[PDB]
């Protein structure tokens with residue numbers, strides 16, 4: 001189960017974060033052991049589509065090849081803290097698993113700037129929940145974490161040395177699909 005109430009960035013700039021562009025996960029920290037594979041790749045696009053806050057997600061296991069996309073409308077809990085009801089889609093936005101109650105994740109932006117971010121997420125999915133997950137994001141694929149986001153990791157009382165890098169997996173990303181999905 002999840003255990004953390006992540007605190008959102010003071011002065012979080014929502015329009016900058018939710019600008020329709022792509023964020024790549026470069027490093028992640030799962031608090032629960034064996035909650036996720038040790039080799040993984042993920043990215044998301046976050047934007048507003050016809051007035052609604054939206055995220056599109058991409059997950060790829062670089063070993064098993066398991067791949068899936070999701071689209072969510074976000075509801076606001078407070079500035080920088082959201083609840084997202086996801087539907088699983090193909091890369092084109094065709095629905096594979098409909099939105100359903102109990103299938104949701106929370107999403108807190110703990111730090112963000114032009115190029116980087118630190119987020120916390122808590123996934124709830126039927127009988128397949130996920131414990132707390134933190135992720136370092138960058139606008140550039142596989143970019144090394146800069147001093148600002150690393151300092152934010154420290155300020156959150158987390159040890160960056162514990163984060164797992166995604167940069168050494170052979171991962172490729174369909175940016176174009178992620179952007180398109182925002183409207184789906």
Ligand code: HEM
Nearest residue numbers: 025028036037040041042070086087088105121123128135
């Ligand atoms: C590298 C970082 C991440 C890893 C290693 C990871 C790992 C996983 C894994 C292994 C699953 C499979 C669950 C299953 O088999 O049903 C999953 C599902 C999911 N994750 Fe992640 N995840 C990451 C980042 C994220 C982020 C940043 C978000 C939200 C912004 C997110 C949201 C979700 C959602 C919504 C599902 C269920 C999708 C569906 O069933 O349609 N994940 N994740």
